[PDB]
């Protein structure tokens, strides 16, 4: 057991632990990214519906009223 051999063994162990910690951190970040992704889908649906319904709410009243005069 040379000091340098023990240092090498601790080096391999340290590399493995560092990759493991990076894996946990990346997974924890991916959870937040998933949350933002779900919010983005809900908001896409909501905003397209709001676009359609707002356009209709602004115009349809007068347009229907004028079509009733034809």
């Amino acid at each position: 057991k040379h000091p340098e051999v023990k240092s090498a063994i601790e080096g391999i162990k340290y590399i493995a632990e560092t990759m493991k910690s990076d894996q946990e951190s990346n997974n924890a970040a991916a959870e937040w990214k998933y949350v933002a992704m779900v919010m983005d889908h809900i908001l896409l649906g909501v905003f397209m519906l709001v676009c359609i319904i707002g356009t209709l709410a602004v115009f349809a009243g007068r347009l229907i009223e004028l079509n009733q005069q034809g």
Partner: peptide
């Protein structure tokens, strides 16, 4: 026996490089 000394030196170099990256990342 190039293995013993030189491959221990290589593995140690990888370990210290990783430590330097971790230390530098703690400052960032």
């Amino acid at each position: 026996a190039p293995e013993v000394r030189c491959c221990v030196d290589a593995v140690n170099f990888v370990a210290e490089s990783t430590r330097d990256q971790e230390a530098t990342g703690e400052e960032v």
